[PDB]
Amino acid sequence: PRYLKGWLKDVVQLSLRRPSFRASRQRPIISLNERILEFNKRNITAIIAEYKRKSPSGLDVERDPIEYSKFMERYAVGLSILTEEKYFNGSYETLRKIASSVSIPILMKDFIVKESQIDDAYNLGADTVLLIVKILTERELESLLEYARSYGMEPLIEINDENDLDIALRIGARFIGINSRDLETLEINKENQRKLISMIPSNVVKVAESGISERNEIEELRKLGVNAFLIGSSLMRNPEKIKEFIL
Ligand SMILES: O=C(O)c1ccccc1NC[C@@H](O)[C@H](O)[C@H](O)COP(=O)(O)O
Structure with missing residues (x-):
């Protein structure tokens, strides 16, 4: 991985030693990015609902993962499940239970630094994974991207600045997440996010990430060309x- 300091250095070390999960895979892959394109075509707001019990920025909520996913399944284009254990209180177990309970696309959200984590996502039932440009070197991102694609997954490649975008474009990313929150400092910058969204090629499926709480924010973002939220x-x-967001 890249040179890292702070909590990022720590979570990456946890990921490096994350034990693999052996399981048989049932349902075939359901492309999240393609479903986003069809929601766009049918003019339905595409919301990726995320399940996370805790977050370093302070979230602490107790809500049943299964009931939450089944409810979200009625409206969401896909689900994002945190499987990072220490900071987000997620687990492979929760992803597995949710994947057996819903039939919409599932993004496994973690800090992926090794191939076995993509193997884990696949075996657990996820349809795609998140790859973060800022914690990986360009060679690692490229290898991991090709590896996810060997399972028929188009990973969501997350960028936070112009340098991230240059790398993302160079390696051929087709599905990009623009995170308004800086992973290292936890600061949210909406303006920087809008600047990056405006630089992305029109043929790349764009997902706005973080800090969205109002329907009007979704509308502004949609006009900038964002495909999903x-x-x-x-x-x-x-x-x-979720009912207010899809109006
Ligand atoms: O949410 C956090 O507190 C946080 C802190 C440090 C690093 C990453 C973080 N979030 C990861 C990120 O993938 C966010 O969960 C999603 O983009 C959605 O964010 P939200 O809607 O909760 O603001």
Whole structure:
């Protein structure tokens, strides 16, 4: 991985020693990015609802993962499940239970630094994975991207700045997440996010990530060309908000 300091250095060390999960895979892959394109075509707001019990920025919510996913399944284009254990209180177990309970696309969200984690995502039932440009070197990102594609997954490649975008474009990313939150400092910068969204090629499926809590924010973002919106905190605190978001 890249040179890292702080909590990022720590979570990457945890991922490096994350034990693999052996399991048989049932349902075939359901492409999240393609479903996003069809929701766009049918003019339905594409929301990726995220399940996370805890977060370094302070979220702490107790809500049943299964009931939450089944409810979200009625409206969401896909689900994002945190499997990182120490900071997000996620687990492979929760992803497995959810994947057996819903039939919409599932993104496994963790800090992926090795191939066995993609093997884990596949065996657990996820349809795609998140790859973060800022914690990986360009060679690692490229290998991991090709590896995810060997399972028929188009990974969501997350960028946070212009340098991330240059790398993402160079390696041929077709599905990009623009995170308004800096992983290292936890600061949210909406303006920087909008600047990056405006630089992305029109043929790349774009997902706005972090800090969305109002329907008007979704509308502004949609006009900038964003294809889908990944929302976690506001939905975890109030699942019913999904109804306002898809209006
Ligand atoms: O949410 C956090 O507190 C946080 C802190 C440090 C690093 C990453 C973090 N979030 C990871 C990120 O993938 C977010 O969960 C999603 O983009 C959704 O964010 P939200 O809607 O909850 O603001």
